Structure formats: C-alpha cells, structure tokens
Amino acid sequence: DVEFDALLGSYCNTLSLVRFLELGLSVACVCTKFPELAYMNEGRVQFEV
Amino acid sequence: CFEADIAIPSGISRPDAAALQRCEGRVVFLPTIRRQLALADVAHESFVSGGVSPDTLGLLLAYRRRFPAVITRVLPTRIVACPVDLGLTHAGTVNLRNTSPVDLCNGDPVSLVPPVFEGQATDVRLESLDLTLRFPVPLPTPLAREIVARLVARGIRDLNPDPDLNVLYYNGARLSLVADVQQLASVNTELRSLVLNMVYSITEGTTLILTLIPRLLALGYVNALLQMQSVTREAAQLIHPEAPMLMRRLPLYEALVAWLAHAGQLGDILALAPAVRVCTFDGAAVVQSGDMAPVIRYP
Amino acid sequence: CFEADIAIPSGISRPDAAALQRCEGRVVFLPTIRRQLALADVAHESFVSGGVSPDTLGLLLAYRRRFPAVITRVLPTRIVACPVDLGLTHAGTVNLRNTSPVDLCNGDPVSLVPPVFEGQATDVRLESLDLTLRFPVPLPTPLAREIVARLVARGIRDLNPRTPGELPDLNVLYYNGARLSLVADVQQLASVNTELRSLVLNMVYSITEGTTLILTLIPRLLALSAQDGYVNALLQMQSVTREAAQAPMLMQDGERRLPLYEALVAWLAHAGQLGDILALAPAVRVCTFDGAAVVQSGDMAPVIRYP
Amino acid sequence: HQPLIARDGPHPVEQPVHNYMTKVIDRRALNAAFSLATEAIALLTGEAL
Amino acid sequence: ETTRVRADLVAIGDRLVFLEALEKRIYAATNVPYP
Amino acid sequence: ARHETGGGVNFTLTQPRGNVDLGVGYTAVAATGTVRNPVTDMGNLPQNF
Amino acid sequence: PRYHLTRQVTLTDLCQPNAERAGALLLALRHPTDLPHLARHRAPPGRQTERLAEAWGQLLEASESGCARAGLVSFNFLVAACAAAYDARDAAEAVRAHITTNYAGARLDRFSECLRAMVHTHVFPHEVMRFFGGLVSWVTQDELASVTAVCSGPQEATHTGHPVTIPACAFVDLDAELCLGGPGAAFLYLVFTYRQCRDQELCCVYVVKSQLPPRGLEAALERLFGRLRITTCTYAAFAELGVMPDDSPRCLHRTERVGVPVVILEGVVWRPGGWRACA
C-alpha cells in the first residue's frame, strides 16, 4: 500500500504601503513638521486681510 | 496603571484653566476605557438618563455602573488619569483629595453622591464651554454605610410628619451632617425618588411574608425549623404586626419574583462597595481635609 | 495567573479535539486548586451526586461548592486554566467567551448560571472519554437575579398543587423585547427546600422593632398614587401593596436608640442580601478596551475583576 | 493580511489582524466508455485469418 | 518570493481638480465606514 | 506607549497633531445628491407614556 | 506590585513589637479614641449604655493620646485576654504567660473587661482593630513606636518568605477545620465567635483552616458550631486573612521567643478581604 496526504498551496497577498503624498487629496493640505506640539496650549495662527 | 487621556475642548478662560488647577487629584467617572477620551464623557450633563437631571438614585445607578478614574497630573490639551480599576492588586499608588472626615490609614474609601454633603460644593463648573463636574465624595466603608441609611431615615420623618437623627459622632470629631440654611430643603427633594425605593421594598415583602408563611408549612424540615431560630421572634412579629395591620396564591407567587427582583436591584444600588484602598507608607496615618494621601488599587 | 493545568488524560476522538478548541473562553468548575488534575472531576458526571443528578437549583448548589476556572490556552497535551477565585490578577484581562442569547451591555457584572435555556443547552459530548459537558451561561446580573427567583418559586409551586392547572408559567422573560422560554422538567425537593428556608430565615431577621413604624404608612403609599407618575409606575399592579390596603403600639422604652435608623440596617443585612445567598457570586465585569458598547453572542469579551 | 486606519478618541483603538484559512481538494472523476462487437476481437487477434 | 503619480484631472470652466475616489483603495476591508 | 497585560506586552502608538482652517472666507462646500435608502421604514408606531 | 511597605506610628503602650516575635499577626486600632458614642447608639435600651464610657477609659489608663495615637494591636493581646473566655483554659492561658512576662496583664485586665463590655452594648469588636500585617520591621524607639508591618497582598509573606514564617501563636488557635483531608491550597480567615448572654458576652479569636470559598464558608459558619444557643443576633463575623497557597507547609511546634505552642505557616497570599456580620 502506498499513501500520502500532500500539501499543495500557500499564497500571500501584498500589503500595499500607500503614502499620503500620493493621492489627490494631498493637494488641499500643506503638512509640515513641528515637534513638541504637545507642549503648547497655543501655537495658533494670526493673519491680516 | 495604563494612563488614559481626556481631551480638553476648545477655548476656556484662565479661571476655567484655574478651575482645572483646583482639581488635580479628584475622582472622575467615565463610560468606556478608550485610551483617548473627551470631556463630553465626563460632565454631569453626561449623566442624563431619561431626559431630566439624575437624582441621587440616578447617580448611584451610574456610580455603580461606570468606571472610576483619578487624575494624577493635570495638563493643557489633555487630562492624565491613571485609572483605578485597571492593574493588579495593591499596585500603582495614586493620590486623592480628602473631604471633611479623616480617611484613616485604612478604611477602603468609597465614591458616592455629592448631595449627601454640600450640593454646590464640588459641583465645579467650567464657565466657557458651560459644563459641570460633580466630583464624588470618597468616604470610608463604615461611615459611608452609616450616612446612607440616615438621611433616608430622615426622609421618613420628612415624609409624613406630626429623636434628631443628625449628630453622628466620629472617633474624635462631631460631624455636622446638617448644612441647614439652603441644603436640607433640597435634600428631601433630591433623595425624593430614593426614599420610595427603601419603603416599597419593605411594604411589599413584609405584607408578602405574612401571607406567605401562613400559606406555607401546610401546603417538613423547613416547617418546624421555620420558627426554630425564630421562636418568639417571627411568631412575636406575627403577634405584633398582623394584629395592627390587615391580612390569593397565583398573584402572590407572581409578586414573589417581582419584589425579590427589586431586592436584587437595591443591593447593587445600596451598601457602597469599596473600590480603592488607603494603605499608605511613612505617613502620619491620619489624613486631613485638603491634603493628599497615597491610595492603593484594590480592596 | 498562578498557572493551573488540566492534561488530556487518555486518547482523543479526532474531531472532538477540535471541539475543545471552540471552547476557548468557557468556564470549567474544578473543585480544587491544583498544579495538575485529571479531567474526571471536570464533567457533569462529577456534578451528578450519589445516584442522582442535580436540578437547575441543585446545580446552583452544586456550583456553590466548586471553583470556576477560565480556559486560557488549549494544547493537545493540556488545558491551562486560571483560578478565578484567586488568580484574577490580570491587567491583561484574561478573556472569556459569551455563550448566551442576550447581547449584554458594556459595564455589566457577569455571574454564571447553569444551562437552563430552551435552545442553548451547551451540550458537547465526548465518547472516547465518556463524559457530558454543560457549560455555564454567562449573563448580566440583574437578568441573572430575575431568573433564580423564578425557578425557586416554580419549585415553591412544586410543594403545593389546590389551584387549577392554568398557572402563570414563570417561563416568559423580558429584556427590552426578547421573549425567553426556559426549561421546566424536574424539580428536586431538597434543592428547593434548602433554598426556600434561607429565603424564609433571612426574611425573619430582616424585620426588627423599629421596622414596624414603617408599616403604618401603607395607606400613605396610595395617596401618592393618583397624583404623580413615578409612584403609580412604582406601585405594581400584581402586588400585595394594592391588595393589603383594604398603630404605634407604644411600648416605648428609653426612646434614644434611633429606632427608625436601626430598622434599615438589619433589613439590608438579610433582605438586602437575597440574590447572592441563593445564587453564585458575581466576579466578572464587562470591560472592552476599544470603546465597543456591547459584546455580541459568541464574542471574546475582556474580563476584569470583582464588581 | 488586512491593513487598518488609526482613528482617535471615543472609537476604540485598533490592532492588525491575520486570517490563515485552509481549504480542501474535492476529487471528481469523469467517465467515458466504448464498445467493440464480438466479431472484431478475433479479427484483431489474428484468429479468423 | 518631485515625481509623477497617476490620478484623474478633470478641467472645468478654466480650472483643474484632482477628481479621485476613495474606499476602493484605502478604506476597503478595514471595518471603517466610508466618511 | 507601552502597557503590560495578560499574555504579553502590548505596545500602543499615537501621534499628536492638529489642524487649522487657514481660509478667511468659506472653503470646501459639500453637496448632497443621491440616496441609497431610508434607514427607517417611515413609521406606524404608537408612543407609550 | 508584589512588594509593598506600610507604616504607622503608634505607642509601645500596645503590642511592644520588640517584645513580640518577628512574625506576629498585628491588628491596627482604627477608630482608637472612639466608643463613648457608639456605646450609647446601636443597642436596645436594656443594655445600660454607661459601661463602655468607662471601660475603654480604663484601658488607656493602662494603655492622653498626644501625637502618637493608640494602635498596632498585637495578635497576642486578644488570645490571652479571651483565654479565660473561650473553651480553652490553661492552654490558651499560656498566651498570658507569654504576654505578661514579655509585654503586661495590666493592659490585659482593663481590656478583658472591655471584652465583656464592648460585646455588652452590641459594640462588637469586628470592624474595630482592622487588619494591618505581619510585623516586617520594628524601627521603634525606646517607649515609642515606628513599625513597618506591610498590608497589601501576597508580598508580606514573600518578602518574609524569600527571607518571619507567620506563627499561629497558639495550637488551640489555627482551628484544624477540614479533617476530611485532601491536597490543595489553604484559605485563612479571622472569625470572632460570640455567645451573647449565655456565657455573658463571650469573646473569641482564632483562625480557621479551609480549602473553601467565601460562599462555601458561610454555611461552614452555620455548621460545626455549638454556640447557636442565643435567640441577640449578628454573631460570628469573619474576613479574609488570605490564601496560604500550600497545605504542605503547616507545622506543629511549642518553641517561641515561656513555652507557648505555635504553628509555622510558610508562604501566604495576604488577601485583606472584607468583613460580614448579619446573623
């Protein structure tokens, strides 16, 4: 008697690492680096017209 | 520990900021344990349950329901509280603000309602965003179980009138329960629903048992042993109450569950279980009002 | 956790090894604190006493003097159980499985009840190791306290017949909707009798001397009935309070003992403790970290300590 | 393998998940058949020559 | 085992917009309601 | 931000950030034109006091 | 966090831990200057409430509070003062030969009067003298006291178990319940068994031995007793002394510090527990 229970398949999907500066909604925002924003109670912006 | 953050909302004043500086070390209740929270889950306006303001019953439902949190360090834009209910037993020492009794070296203090003390004390209001933080009172287990049964006993004599229940000495001090001038008239209308709960669970059961036990024992180990430990107690109560009161099985046993359903409500309502412990180190063992105390996690 | 193991003693039915996998988060009543123990005292054959199996009130009394344990991790060699009575010191909040028709709440105390439901028997059978398994049904505690009063009073109607056969079944339950019917098959007497006596004997001590003054205000109760909403809803229709309405008895010795204040103490001592002396003690509390307000039927809820 | 999106505040924090499902071959066997009449075999054998 | 990115740029009036749709890309399968 | 629970350690990560309007006038309107379905079945239920 | 320290500064008018052992089951004295008031309250009026007004007042005569409050009650101070009370004489009284030769019966004789006077006006000695711990260090002065005697869970008998080994201080004490013997872990409790107007307000202090839950202890508190013969009520209070997570390490000795019988108990989860007194 000859018998075997065989293993035939294993597949992984790609996990797409999608950056924020790719999509079309990057246009409306100007993101910029500022550390220590946790330390302020106000860093808030004042503008003329 | 697992410190949880409560978010400060938008523009507050400096006295609203200073109101946040007079609360460093209070007790805070919250519904869920999300690592970032907002102030909208905190306020007394977040205690509405039926469209109206909650009573001391409606608070003590939630005061046994939602979760205690103690603010260690106050912050701009955040509120850091290391919550009590998370963590293993007797770890993560936290610090509280005492109110007028002692909070001795032990006692296992319990959060409970504000209007058993001065109602508009510790009802600290934010002026800008217009919300109210009614902080609970941390009382230790003997006196916390003491004062809860006194005002509802005082509510009886205030219910249908014709000694004075309000002296109640501590170990050293004489504790003035009565804050007369404007509070006690608000007391008997803010424990208003609660007195009816302590009454109706007594009037139902006693008038149920005096038509239960005469309907029992002849309808036998429980029979003769009914009045075995109740000799001249229950038959004497059958002699005293059944004479100066009035005197049906299928509504009766239907009322049996319903009263005892209400009984299981009240045990969760009343008796004020301990949640956190005072068992400090290298202290004077005796805490005073307005002073901090090292408080440890589990009873 | 103070780790406690239960090994797989002798052989395996090969699908039934997978049956032990889907019992992760359930409860084992093991009547000890062991570092290792056989699977013989685990099953319902150990719950069966000498000759006779307990009723759903006797299983309450059988779940009285044993120790619940949480399935933590399932090996093909052992099953690691965490001793609920001691080893609940878990900031990791060791997880449980809700096997119950009720979607619970967040923040419920959770107490354990034997399987008494009409369709959630929780019967899983092992034939290689000849054992029967009844898992307890974790439920919210007011809904748990609504059940145990029914089943004893149903056994109170097992003592006296008298009435016509159309009795109120005590077999329709109410949670926001949700008509529930349970099983009424057998009522063993001693499980009813010892449960009935503590219902009698505690209600003895819960009456005191100053309690009697409250009984005078029974006609005062119905004076609030026709003039508000809250009282009239509080006053039940199927109550003896509406039936008994159709006095100091002076005996005044000393009068400085606070007789009315002393009444509410000892009443709360025994009539205040009626859910927990009849049923099991609640030590399981609903606590989800993600802010989820309810926990689905079949889910894995995180579990924190005594309420 | 599934990605996730970090929310904030009252909605709970998330954590990545994995799936690991396993599926089983089913075996079909389809059939054909044919015939040879009796006169043809000894013709193919070389007997009736 | 400063660059070009594909998008869709409809020009209307005398203007230009990045007309792009989500949830087929960056909201799918994460149990998030699409805002 | 770490927190040790049952099982093993459990790292939590959060990045604090903020925004601003940065527009003196109105920006970013949002129209509403298509319907999937009603959520309710539009009625016939008594109110019970 | 499985190691803790607690500290309370009191007198050596009480325990005198320098006269105690390294292992003693200390009580506090919470509400120490209390009970003239609750002598008057909580009792039916046939108890003549002017008794405890003088009774504790004679105690601190033997011991002005000052700034060092009366506290840190020893385990010895209740056993010998109830030695004449409960059903063990000349063996429980060996605890009195332990105290008066090391500590003083002058403070016992005022307090054995309190043990007939506290229980007289229904001021029962549970929920006064709350549990504190196992006497880790004794950094006390000569006539004053400063003790660290940690509460707070299992760590008291690990940090005196990786090194006081928790005596029972009387072989009559550590009540050998569950002679129906089996393997497991021990669950320790502190029961005050009373007899009200039969033995004229009896006082009792001893520790039980059980592998039993709190729900399997109350019916165990109704069984095995012969002191039911009362009717007032609310007898036999108890709290959790915690878990000894081993039944193998109990012992039987008579050597301490006067030959007093004593039981070694090594390794204890000190779950501080809660009291209950209703029946």
Residue B207 backbone zone (phi > 0: left; psi -120 to 50: alpha; other: beta) = alpha
Spatial separation of the C-alpha atoms in residues B293 and C9, rounded to whole Å: 53
In this complex, how many residue pairs, one in chain B and one in chain F, have their CB atoms less than 8 Å apart?
A: 5
Report which of C123, C121, C117 is spatially closest to residue C151, judged by C-alpha positions: C117
* A37-43 contacts at long range (C-beta below 8 A, 24 or more positions apart): A37/F16, A37/F17, A37/F18, A38/B77, A38/B78, A38/F16, A40/B76, A40/B77, A41/B76, A41/B77
Is D4's CB within 8 Å of E30's CB? Answer: yes
Partners of G231 on chain B (C-beta within 8 Å) are: 229, 232-233
Cβ of residue D25 closer than 8 Å to a chain A Cβ: yes
Partners of A27 on chain E (C-beta within 8 Å) are: 18
Spatial separation of the C-alpha atoms in residues G11 and G140, rounded to whole Å: 9
Residues near B137 by beta carbon (within 8 Å), at least 6 away in sequence: B99, B111, B112, B113, B114, B116, B117, B122
Specify the amino acid at residue G6.
T
> Quick check: helix, strand or coil at residue C266?
helix
Residues near B123 by beta carbon (within 8 Å), at least 6 away in sequence: B44, B114, B132, B133, B134
| Structure tokens that stand for B21 in this block | 């500086």
> Quick check: helix, strand or coil at residue C160?
coil
In Å, how far is C304's CA from the nearest CA of chain F? 11
Is C33's CB within 8 Å of G42's CB? Answer: no
Cβ of residue F6 closer than 8 Å to a chain C Cβ: yes
Resolution (A): 5.4
In Å, how far is F6's CA from the nearest CA of chain C? 3
Indicate the DSSP class of residue B134: E
Spatial separation of the C-alpha atoms in residues G209 and G211, rounded to whole Å: 7
Q: In what order do the strands lie in the sheet with B277-278?
A: B94-95, B294-296, B277-278
Cβ of residue D17 closer than 8 Å to a chain A Cβ: no
Cα R_g (chain A), whole angstroms: 26
Phi, psi for F10 (deg, rounded to 5): -140, 100
| Structure tokens that stand for C61 in this block | 């009394």
Phi, psi for B39 (deg, rounded to 5): -80, -15
Q: Which of E20, E23, E27, E34 should be substituted to probe chain A, the one whose Cβ sees the most A Cβ atoms within 10 Å?
A: E20
Specify the amino acid at residue C275.
G
Spatial separation of the C-alpha atoms in residues F27 and F18, rounded to whole Å: 18
Partners of G42 on chain C (C-beta within 8 Å) are: 257, 262
| F16, F22, F24 ranked by CB distance to A37: nearest | F16
| Structure tokens that stand for B280 in this block | 């400090």
Q: In what order do the strands lie in the sheet with C284-286?
A: C137-140, C109-113, C284-286, C303-304
The approach used to solve this structure was: cryo-EM
> Quick check: helix, strand or coil at residue B4?
strand
Is B253's CB within 8 Å of C289's CB? Answer: no
Report which of B271, B276, B268 is spatially closest to residue B64, judged by C-alpha positions: B268
Report which of B79, G184, G16, B21 is spatially closest to residue C35, judged by C-alpha positions: G184
Is B37's CB within 8 Å of D12's CB? Answer: no
For residue B20, CA distances in Å to B43, B125, B231 come to 13, 10, 61
Contact C34, G277 (CB under 8 A): no
Spatial separation of the C-alpha atoms in residues D38 and F36, rounded to whole Å: 72
Partners of B1 on chain F (C-beta within 8 Å) are: 3
Cβ of residue A37 closer than 8 Å to a chain E Cβ: no
In Å, how far is F17's CA from the nearest CA of chain C? 21
Cα R_g (chain B), whole angstroms: 23
Q: For residue C86, how many C-alpha atoms fall within 13 Å in the half-sphere facing its CB?
A: 28
Is G127's CB within 8 Å of B142's CB? Answer: yes
User: Which residue blocks in chain B are alpha helix, DSSP H?
Assistant: 14-19, 56-63, 141-157, 180-190, 192-209, 221-224, 234-239, 249-269
In Å, how far is F3's CA from the nearest CA of chain B? 6
| Structure tokens that stand for B265 in this block | 């409500």
- Strand B277-278 relative to strand B294-296: parallel, antiparallel, unpaired? antiparallel
> Quick check: helix, strand or coil at residue C233?
helix
In Å, how far is A10's CA from the nearest CA of chain F? 29
Give the E-state strand segments of chain A in sequence order: none
Element (H, E) at C62: helix C58-64
Cβ of residue G50 closer than 8 Å to a chain B Cβ: no
Partners of F20 on chain A (C-beta within 8 Å) are: 44-45
Report which of G223, C188, C159, C162 is spatially closest to residue B220, judged by C-alpha positions: C159
Please name the residue of chain A whose CA is at the shortest distance from the CA of residue D2. Answer: A15
Specify the amino acid at residue G70.
A
Contact B143, B136 (CB under 8 A): no
Q: Which of F5, F10, F11, F45 should be substituted to probe chain C, the one whose Cβ sees the most C Cβ atoms within 10 Å?
A: F5
Cβ of residue B91 closer than 8 Å to a chain G Cβ: yes
Contact B277, B90 (CB under 8 A): yes
Q: Which residues of E touch D (CB under 8 A)?
A: 26-27, 29-30, 32
Phi, psi for D17 (deg, rounded to 5): -120, 165
Spatial separation of the C-alpha atoms in residues G101 and G120, rounded to whole Å: 30
Report which of B143, B104, B282 is spatially closest to residue G70, judged by C-alpha positions: B104
Contact B159, C220 (CB under 8 A): yes
In Å, how far is F11's CA from the nearest CA of chain B? 11
User: Burial letters for C264-287: b for 16+ Cβ neighbours within 10 Å, e otherwise?
Assistant: bbbbbbbbbbbbbbbbbbbbbbbb
Please name the residue of chain A whose CA is at the shortest distance from the CA of residue E18. Answer: A24
Give the E-state strand segments of B46-188 in sequence order: 67-74, 79-83, 94-95, 110-112, 123-126, 131-134, 137-139
Contact B259, B205 (CB under 8 A): yes
Please name the residue of chain A whose CA is at the shortest distance from the CA of residue F19. Answer: A31
Spatial separation of the C-alpha atoms in residues B148 and B153, rounded to whole Å: 9
Contact G28, G8 (CB under 8 A): yes
Neighbour subunits, D (≥3 Cβ pairs < 8 A)? A, B, C, E
Element (H, E) at C279: none
Cβ of residue C304 closer than 8 Å to a chain F Cβ: no
Contact C250, C104 (CB under 8 A): no
Query: In chain C, what is the straight-line distance between the N-terminal and C-terminal CA atoms, in Å?
Result: 19
Spatial separation of the C-alpha atoms in residues G229 and F33, rounded to whole Å: 84
Paired with B175 in beta bridges are none
Tokens 């004062």 belong to: B147
Environment class of residue B141 by beta-carbon count within 10 Å: exposed (0-12), middle (13-18) or buried (19+)?
Answer: buried
Cβ of residue C173 closer than 8 Å to a chain B Cβ: no
Partners of D10 on chain B (C-beta within 8 Å) are: 32, 34, 37-38, 41
Report which of C117, C172, C147, C134 is spatially closest to residue C297, judged by C-alpha positions: C117
- Breaks after residues in chain E, judged by C–N over 2.5 Å: 1
Environment class of residue B208 by beta-carbon count within 10 Å: exposed (0-12), middle (13-18) or buried (19+)?
Answer: buried
In this complex, how many residue pairs, one in chain B and one in chain C, have their CB atoms less than 8 Å apart?
A: 205
Number of neighbouring beta carbons within 10 Å of residue B144? 23
Cβ of residue F4 closer than 8 Å to a chain C Cβ: yes
| Structure tokens that stand for C190 in this block | 């001693």
In Å, how far is C303's CA from the nearest CA of chain D? 17
Spatial separation of the C-alpha atoms in residues B260 and C206, rounded to whole Å: 14
Helices B249-269 and C141-156 cross at an angle (nearest 10°) of 150
Paired with C4 in beta bridges are C81
In Å, how far is C117's CA from the nearest CA of chain G? 25
Spatial separation of the C-alpha atoms in residues G81 and D27, rounded to whole Å: 87
Q: Using alpha carbons only, what angle is made at residue B161 by residues B156 and B165, rounded to the nearest 5 degrees?
A: 50
Q: Which of C71, C289, C305 should be substituted to probe chain F, the one whose Cβ sees the most F Cβ atoms within 10 Å?
A: C289
Is B36's CB within 8 Å of D12's CB? Answer: no
Spatial separation of the C-alpha atoms in residues C15 and G20, rounded to whole Å: 63
Partners of A41 on chain B (C-beta within 8 Å) are: 76-77
A–G contact (≥3 CB pairs within 8 Å)?
A: no
Q: How many contiguous H segments (helices) and E segments (strands) does chain C have? A: 8, 13
Cβ of residue B2 closer than 8 Å to a chain F Cβ: yes
Q: For residue G147, how many C-alpha atoms fall within 13 Å in the half-sphere facing its CB?
A: 34
Report which of B57, B145, B263, B254 is spatially closest to residue C141, judged by C-alpha positions: B263
Tokens 């600290």 belong to: B124
Spatial separation of the C-alpha atoms in residues G16 and G21, rounded to whole Å: 10
